Amino acid sequence: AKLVRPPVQVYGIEGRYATALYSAASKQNKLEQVEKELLRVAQILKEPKVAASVLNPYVKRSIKVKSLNDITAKERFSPLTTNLINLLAENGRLSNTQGVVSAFSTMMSVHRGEVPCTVTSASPLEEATLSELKTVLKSFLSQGQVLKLEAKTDPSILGGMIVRIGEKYVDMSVKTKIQKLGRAMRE
Amino acid sequence: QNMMRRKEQEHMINWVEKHVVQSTIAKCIADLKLLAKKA
């Protein structure tokens, strides 16, 4: 049986179940459907009642998975989502469910081309320069991508700006500049 | 004599650095300009 691998990989049992579902969905073209239903079942399994029942280490595996079937089948679940649910339950991997979902979300965060990038500066920024910066660091991208800006503010860098886009990373802050000064003048 | 040439050179090289630290958004706009010329 041949599996199609997602363009980004997650590991651990979380990543294994995540890529299992990615292959299972890309083989019937239900990516967005199972993604939204995964987020919703994650919200369901975190309400205190079932979120507290799922991790009780004595409730029998058969009875737990049957009750979980009862609970999920009412939301009109497509077969793939409840299949993954029963596969996690009969394997005792329920406390990890949300994590898997989280992982799966990140997988879609690469299928849509979402490149997460950070621009950290000393003080908060106004959105005119922020928008022209979105334009600037959007110029790097190739054909067909979307970008997610998550800017934070730290005065410890005393100014400048740090652009960590995916793996690329430019350090234009005054701090690394003055460290360069110290190390170069001392040597 | 040369030792004093070193002792004062090594002190004057740190003072000037611990002095500029107290010293304008012109740098940030320059960074976006530097980023504009990144290509």
Partner: peptide
């Protein structure tokens, strides 16, 4: 170039 003005000003201060 805050680095360069820093250098020149500290040179003028040390001199």
């Amino acid at each position: 170039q805050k680095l360069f003005v820093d250098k020149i000003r500290e040179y003028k201060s040390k001199r």
